[PDB]
Design an enzyme around this catalytic site. Structure first.
Site, mmCIF file in Angstrom:
data_model
loop_
_atom_site.group_PDB
_atom_site.id
_atom_site.type_symbol
_atom_site.label_atom_id
_atom_site.label_comp_id
_atom_site.label_asym_id
_atom_site.label_seq_id
_atom_site.Cartn_x
_atom_site.Cartn_y
_atom_site.Cartn_z
ATOM 1 C CG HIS B 41 -0.652 0.097 2.499
ATOM 2 N ND1 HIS B 41 -0.102 1.251 3.020
ATOM 3 C CD2 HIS B 41 -0.746 -0.768 3.540
ATOM 4 C CE1 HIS B 41 0.171 1.074 4.301
ATOM 5 N NE2 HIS B 41 -0.215 -0.143 4.644
ATOM 6 N N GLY B 143 2.143 5.981 10.162
ATOM 7 C CA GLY B 143 3.485 5.764 9.668
ATOM 8 C C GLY B 143 4.198 4.573 10.267
ATOM 9 C CB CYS B 145 2.499 0.857 7.458
ATOM 10 S SG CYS B 145 0.885 1.613 7.799
HETATM 11 C C1 LIG Z 1 -4.085 2.695 2.013
HETATM 12 C C2 LIG Z 1 -4.746 2.010 3.223
HETATM 13 C C3 LIG Z 1 -4.561 0.498 3.082
HETATM 14 C C4 LIG Z 1 -6.237 2.345 3.252
HETATM 15 C C5 LIG Z 1 -4.069 2.540 4.534
HETATM 16 C C6 LIG Z 1 -4.185 3.882 4.882
HETATM 17 C C7 LIG Z 1 -3.573 4.356 6.058
HETATM 18 C C8 LIG Z 1 -2.854 3.489 6.883
HETATM 19 N N1 LIG Z 1 -2.233 4.084 8.109
HETATM 20 C C9 LIG Z 1 -0.918 4.752 8.061
HETATM 21 O O1 LIG Z 1 -0.506 5.236 9.051
HETATM 22 C C10 LIG Z 1 -0.029 4.809 6.804
HETATM 23 C C11 LIG Z 1 -0.331 4.438 5.509
HETATM 24 N N2 LIG Z 1 0.740 4.666 4.777
HETATM 25 C C12 LIG Z 1 1.683 5.169 5.573
HETATM 26 N N3 LIG Z 1 1.208 5.258 6.821
HETATM 27 C C13 LIG Z 1 -2.983 4.144 9.360
HETATM 28 C C14 LIG Z 1 -4.335 3.411 9.114
HETATM 29 O O2 LIG Z 1 -4.351 2.217 9.107
HETATM 30 N N4 LIG Z 1 -5.610 4.147 8.867
HETATM 31 C C15 LIG Z 1 -6.851 3.415 8.617
HETATM 32 C C16 LIG Z 1 -8.023 4.382 8.599
HETATM 33 C C17 LIG Z 1 -9.339 3.646 8.324
HETATM 34 C C18 LIG Z 1 -9.332 2.921 7.011
HETATM 35 C C19 LIG Z 1 -8.089 2.098 6.743
HETATM 36 C C20 LIG Z 1 -6.770 2.725 7.238
HETATM 37 C C21 LIG Z 1 -2.397 3.530 10.612
HETATM 38 C C22 LIG Z 1 -2.586 4.243 11.752
HETATM 39 C C23 LIG Z 1 -2.124 3.759 12.936
HETATM 40 C C24 LIG Z 1 -1.469 2.536 12.948
HETATM 41 N N5 LIG Z 1 -1.305 1.823 11.810
HETATM 42 C C25 LIG Z 1 -1.756 2.314 10.643
HETATM 43 C C26 LIG Z 1 -2.726 2.141 6.533
HETATM 44 C C27 LIG Z 1 -3.344 1.669 5.354
#
Ligand SMILES: CC(C)(C)c1ccc(N(C(=O)c2c[nH]cn2)[C@@H](C(=O)NC2CCCCC2)c2cccnc2)cc1
Ligand SMILES: CC(C)(C)c1ccc(N(C(=O)c2c[nH]cn2)[C@@H](C(=O)NC2CCCCC2)c2cccnc2)cc1
EC number: 3.4.19.12
Lengths: 306, 306
Positions: B41, B143, B145
């Site tokens: 992702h 961040g 991830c």
């Molecule tokens: C593209 C996709 C798959 C929807 C996504 C988007 C954002 C992230 N999150 C990144 O922080 C991040 C993404 N890229 C760099 N950082 C965060 C995250 O999950 N929010 C979620 C919000 C609800 C819907 C799905 C994602 C995260 C926060 C805290 C701990 N863990 C992860 C993970 C996945």
């Protein structure tokens, strides 16, 4: 999201752990530059742990009385001296993995990471709070002595604890890296016991702020308190008195959440008087006192989930 | 003595963490030999997280679409491919700090250590259990991830988890190091939610054995149970059924303590039916399910405090 007891990454400390042997006793040492630090009780005779005189025991040792092993490599001891309850062994090789470091004496209620080690080999890592009674609730087996506690700030390792001994209730006692014990304990076999402990009020308040930052407000109330009225309740529940200095420390968490410190104190008063009614805060069924204000700021988002 | 959630020393993993950037998105990667692994992702557009087609997004990237930074050093990407929900970026330099390692897929109820990282920089370490519902109760901010979970056995690092995303209840979901999700989750923005969870019975029993090893027997009783009668109670309290295989796993702890497995099950039945009467076990006011039989053997003395 989430909230966990979180240790610092341990690699910078792992590269400093060695094994020290004197006679039949082996324990861990900390190798920084050309010095190895270890508990002076490495020289204590098995036959006399009750009444060791360390000056008299140490004068009977030479440099070659001490074996130091770093992994598979032997480090030759070229000098030795006692500093309080530690030995400082000078070795023929400077540790190439020495990190930027400092020695600091921590205060009760502060936290640090522990790298549990056996025979100079790191085994596990966990976070500990220094209790008001100067013990830690560690997890240590025979031969863990010389394991160290530390905090890390911008790649500088602040060493603050060296493990010496276990007390009758199963909790742990040790020194700073100048060899001065935390608490009234001594490095011999005596009847000594941990004193009565108390709950670290400032840390409980910090953790309630963490709960609000992470999105939960169920335990707040419409009341406030004075510092003196809160302290009357704290005494009843074996909580440390709140001081104006501790109120000031909570300033940034109060600002991030919009909850005045004395208003959070009123919430804590109600939780002490009424309990938690089968509910949880940050996953816990009890009030947690093992996280400092700094630990909360380190771990939580800087943006409150409003 | 003592009993704590204990992580493995993290240094061998710290030396593998790097930063991966694609477009405006940065996250963590794992650098082993000449490959960097990271969540696919990283290529998802901010404008379309709802319905990414990763094959179509990835074909539009070149090797130089990806920036990889190891500390202050840039690693040139010389190849790339998708494996399930991971990207495998081939780089021009083999990591000189690569440890002996394996990739393994862990099973529900098993534990591992998590090295939380941001921008390729390790921040903290803690132990997690893989829940029956395939989530972990981590502590992760934006961040995080690409942070990894692992176990260590005789200096071999078994990587078992890479962090991908946070679910609505604040728990965390990710993949093995082949890129296959734990649980039914997907790497896009959907309404997905963790399923109903359950208590890991085998781990509760292991932790009761730990309590006996460490010297406490207050919760034992004079009764026994059949497996089927215990399972009727387990269903009522949302505990996983006990199986004969799990009974067999508890053999060594049963032998060290002299407490038959079904006798310990009778003790657990009474604790579920009657509660703990304001008492603690290993410092806890609740029954703990986050330690496996292996974790207990790893941490406790091999000699029971009789
Ligand atoms: C593209 C996709 C798959 C929807 C996504 C988007 C954002 C992230 N999150 C990144 O922080 C991040 C993404 N890229 C760099 N950082 C965060 C995250 O999950 N929010 C979620 C919000 C609800 C819907 C799905 C994602 C995260 C926060 C805290 C701990 N863990 C992860 C993970 C996945
Ligand atoms: C000589 C002196 C000061 C009395 C002593 C003796 C043994 C040790 N203990 C070593 O394991 C050990 C000693 N040398 C190498 N290993 C253990 C220990 O404290 N038992 C105590 C028994 C009651 C009286 C004091 C010591 C230990 C166990 C678990 C975790 N922490 C430490 C510590 C200090």
């Amino acid at each position: 999201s989430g909230f966990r007891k979180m240790a610092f990454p341990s690699g910078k400390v792992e590269g400093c752990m060695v094994q020290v042997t004197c006679g039949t006793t082996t324990l861990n040492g900390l190798w920084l530059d050309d010095t190895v630090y270890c508990p002076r009780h490495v020289i204590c005779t098995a036959e006399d742990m009750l009444n060791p005189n360390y000056e008299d025991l140490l004068i009977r040792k030479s440099n070659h009385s001490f074996l130091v092993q770093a992994g598979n490599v032997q480090l030759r001891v070229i000098g030795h001296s006692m500093q309080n309850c530690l030995l400082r062994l000078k070795v023929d090789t400077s540790n190439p993995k020495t990190p930027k470091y400092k020695f600091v004496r921590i205060q009760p209620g502060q936290t640090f990471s522990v790298l549990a080690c056996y025979n100079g080999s790191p085994s596990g890592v966990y976070q500990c709070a220094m209790r008001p009674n100067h013990t830690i609730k560690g997890s240590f087996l025979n031969g863990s002595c010389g394991s160290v506690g530390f905090n890390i700030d911008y790649d500088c390792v602040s060493f603050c604890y060296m493990h010496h001994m276990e007390l009758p209730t199963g909790v742990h006692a040790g020194t700073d890296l100048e060899g001065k014990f935390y608490g009234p304990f001594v490095d011999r076999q005596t009847a000594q016991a941990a004193g009565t402990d108390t709950t670290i009020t400032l840390n409980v308040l910090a953790w309630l702020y963490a709960a609000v930052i992470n999105g939960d407000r169920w335990f707040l109330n419409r009341f406030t308190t004075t510092l003196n009225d809160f302290n009357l309740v704290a005494m009843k529940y074996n909580y440390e008195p709140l001081t104006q200095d501790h109120v000031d420390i909570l300033g940034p968490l109060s600002a991030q959440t919009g909850i005045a410190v004395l208003d959070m104190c009123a919430a804590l008063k109600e939780l002490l008087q009424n309990g938690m009614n089968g509910r949880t805060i940050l996953g816990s069924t009890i009030l947690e006192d093992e996280f400092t204000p700094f630990d909360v700021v380190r771990q939580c988002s800087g943006v409150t989930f409003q």
